[PDB]
Amino acid sequence: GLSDGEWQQVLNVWGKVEADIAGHGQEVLIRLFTGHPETLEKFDKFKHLKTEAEMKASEDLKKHGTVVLTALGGILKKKGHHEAELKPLAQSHATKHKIPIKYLEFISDAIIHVLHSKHPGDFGADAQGAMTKALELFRNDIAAKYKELGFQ
């Protein structure tokens, strides 16, 4: 549950991401894969990537980064009213991709890390607080759908 002031901060921060969605998406996935290598194993189309250089050079990874952040951005712009948008993602990630909720925690923190890295001194305490709450909300609603499906 975010205030409108907090949603305003979230969408303000998101403006930074939308100026370069592919660059942000790329670095988020790289931070995930390098920080938590077991996550790479869930992707049959990235599992071949052994080095970060190969990751950085991968146009398909950048493409998928765009798909992921486009989807997340669509969800964030709903300001919490994202049932329709979130349900198919929860379902595909639980039933098809088999992504435990822990990995969504991982990618949440990776987003926070990337924003600080690309915008040092431009991602204030209030902005981090708001973005963090937004990602927690996202994670929590996915977690509810996971519970429904009995997915661990």
**Per the annotation, where are the binding residues for O2?**
64
Helices and strands, number each (H, E), in the chain = 8, 0
Cβ proximity to ligand HEM: between 25 and 123 the closer is: 25
| Residues in Cβ contact with 31 at an 8 Å cutoff, skipping those fewer than 6 apart | 110, 113, 114
How far is Cα 103 from Cα 119, in angstroms, rounded to an integer?
Answer: 24
Q: Of the ranges 2-10, 17-25, 93-101, 122-130, which one interacts with ligand HEM (CB under 6 A)?
A: 93-101
Buried/exposed 19-41: b ≥16 CB within 10 Å, e otherwise? eebebbbbbbbbbbbeebeebbe
Q: Of the ranges 5-13, 19-27, 40-48, 118-126, which one interacts with ligand HEM (CB under 6 A)?
A: 40-48
Looking at residues 49 to 88 of the shown chain, list those that interact with ligand HEM (rule: CB under 6 A): 67-68, 71-72
Interface size with ligand HEM, residues (CB under 6 A): 17
Interface with ligand HEM (CB under 6 A): 39, 42-45, 67-68, 71-72, 89, 92-93, 97, 99, 103-104, 107
